[PDB]
Amino acid sequence: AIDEIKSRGYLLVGLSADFPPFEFVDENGNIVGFDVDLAKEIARRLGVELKIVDMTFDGLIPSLLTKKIDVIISGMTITEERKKVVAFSDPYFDAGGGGSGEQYGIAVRKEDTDLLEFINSVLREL
């Protein structure tokens, strides 16, 4: 990291802009959606600018591991398989209601505990 992000002055958020209404490319060519608005809010509250890094969906977790992005906010279902490799925020979208079915989370490298705690605070505030 959080201190490193604040020092850099920007948050790099990975997603795959092919999943409306969460992320998509609009009639103007800009990446927009629910997850973009959320990325912006987290950046705003960290005091930093946002850079969205668009990539193919399968590329996200490898990008997060190699530190090309700080977080994934890309309609990503919290799963036990993915918890082997990354940490998730608390869910921010409940596809099925009453916490059933797919719950979307923000993926963070397991080492970045500070950043995950902060993201969880933002989510509760929202």
Ligand SMILES: NC(=[NH2+])NCCC[C@H](N)C(=O)O
């Ligand atoms: N931006 C995207 N293409 N997201 C696809 C998400 C599909 C499903 N929720 C998953 O986590 O695999």
